[PDB]
């Protein structure tokens, strides 16, 4: 009310309203799903279009050969953060000849988003991210929020009506976690998960976006006729 003018102000109940309004931009964003097994990690993203004449907004971004994310909210902010991740992944390679750990990737994003919520003039990032990766400790899935809070999960989903996919994954937890050495079946579980968040619309060929990383699989994105297999 009087305490939402900028990010440097606390409310009387101890809330940061600008951070909460930035969180609101994610709920308006299109749904995206993340899930993993012990061998592979999968991102499934429902892309959104302006109208029938427009293209479908690309949701998934590659950060390195072994890491990448999907976005939900302000796309330019996702571009800024993904670019930062690309540099940090690349710094780890050039200097230490070492693939950046997915856990550190999350820690770095948290600390970057935090600085924006404590300083005058700047603003919080208006986007949520789902980072997947495969490093020295196996497959991983992270959930980034622009408050700074990063969380490691077996599966999750963010965006509009993400509660449907998140409940499904919470039920299916025991099943999909053991889909080891099988990419197509893990994707199928992700495509079935995102389907729980659909209303009126269904998954078409230029609507669906899938990405995967794993043990002997670099981070690769599938769009267009390549995802027709899973509809």
């Amino acid at each position: 009310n009087n305490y939402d003018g900028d990010t440097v102000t606390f409310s009387p109940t101890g809330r940061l309203f600008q951070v909460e309004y930035a969180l609101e931009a994610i709920k308006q964003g299109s749904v995206t799903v993340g899930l993993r097994s012990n061998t592979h990690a999968v991102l499934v993203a429902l892309k959104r279009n302006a109208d029938e004449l427009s293209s479908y907004q690309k949701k998934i971004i590659k950060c390195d050969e072994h890491m990448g994310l999907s976005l939900a909210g302000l796309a330019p902010d996702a571009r800024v953060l993904s670019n930062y991740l690309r540099q940090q992944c690349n710094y780890s390679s050039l200097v230490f000849n070492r693939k950046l750990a997915v856990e550190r990737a999350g820690h770095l994003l948290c600390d970057k988003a935090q600085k924006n919520t404590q300083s005058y003039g700047g603003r919080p990032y208006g986007v949520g991210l789902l980072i997947i990766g495969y490093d020295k400790s196996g497959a991983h899935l992270l959930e980034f929020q622009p408050s700074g809070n990063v969380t490691e999960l077996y599966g999750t989903a963010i965006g509009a009506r993400s509660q449907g996919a998140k409940t499904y994954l919470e039920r299916t937890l025991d099943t999909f976690i053991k889909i080891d050495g099988n990419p197509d079946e893990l994707i199928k579980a992700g495509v079935e998960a995102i389907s729980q968040s659909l209303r009126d619309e269904s998954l078409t060929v230029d609507n669906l976006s899938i990405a995967i990383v794993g043990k002997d699989t670099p981070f690769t994105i599938y769009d267009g006729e390549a995802v027709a297999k899973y509809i």
Binding site: K62, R86, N90, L94
Partner: protein, 222 residues
């Protein structure tokens, strides 16, 4: 006073065919009169069917290859996974080299691959970014020994058609991958004989549309 440069010796060689290209380089690494390594590769696969070697001062050489490899990576990120053409790579390297015009990379750089018509391509650079596409180039310590031999055997220089009274030149033609590798191996054995910084081993990287293949051969270890 501190001297930031050094000479790690060795020598490299690039030859272009019709539908292929080779980039060869000996595996010896030296400083002064000591051998540092008998097998230290300096011909690298940089992705997008581009092989590269920066012979001379190894620290600057490794630094440059490292930066170009990174340049290829960011070209994919910034331009929707587009393949970096050999001509584009060459121009990019010129800017890397010239970027340090007033504190140069002490290296003779050579890259090889296929052009956008699928034909074999060899580009070669000076230490400050000057470049030129050729069918043929030797670089490094024994370049002065090998290069004239290539002029004679690859581009058929000073060779005339027998009985034509030195009027008709020997016609230019592409060489087979088998014939090129013969010239490479003879070039390096000859260079090993007369140059002290060249020897130990020979590593050839062959580039066709199918990908990048490797071949290794022993050289004299004295």
């Amino acid at each position: 006073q501190f001297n930031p440069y050094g000479d790690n010796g060795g020598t490299i060689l690039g030859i272009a065919g019709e539908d292929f290209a080779v980039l060869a380089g000996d595996t010896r690494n030296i400083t002064d009169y000591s051998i540092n390594s008998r097998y230290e590769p300096k011909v690298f696969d940089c992705g997008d069917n581009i092989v590269m070697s920066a012979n001379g001062f190894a620290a600057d050489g490794d630094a440059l290859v490292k930066r170009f490899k990174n340049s290829v990576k960011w070209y994919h990120f910034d331009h929707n996974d587009k393949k970096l053409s050999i001509n584009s790579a060459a121009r990019n390297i010129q800017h890397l080299l010239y970027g340090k015009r007033f504190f140069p990379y002490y290296v003779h750089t050579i890259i090889a691959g296929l052009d956008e018509d699928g034909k074999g391509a060899v580009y070669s650079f000076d230490p400050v970014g000057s470049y030129e596409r050729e069918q043929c180039r030797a670089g490094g310590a024994a370049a002065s020994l090998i290069m004239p031999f290539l002029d004679n055997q690859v581009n058929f220089k000073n060779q005339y058609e027998p009985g034509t009274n030195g009027k008709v030149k020997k016609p230019l033609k592409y060489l087979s991958v088998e014939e090129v590798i013969k010239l490479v191996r003879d070039s390096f054995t000859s260079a090993t004989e007369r140059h002290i910084q060249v020897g130990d081993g020979l590593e050839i990287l062959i580039v066709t549309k199918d990908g990048v293949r490797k071949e290794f051969y022993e050289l004299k270890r004295d």
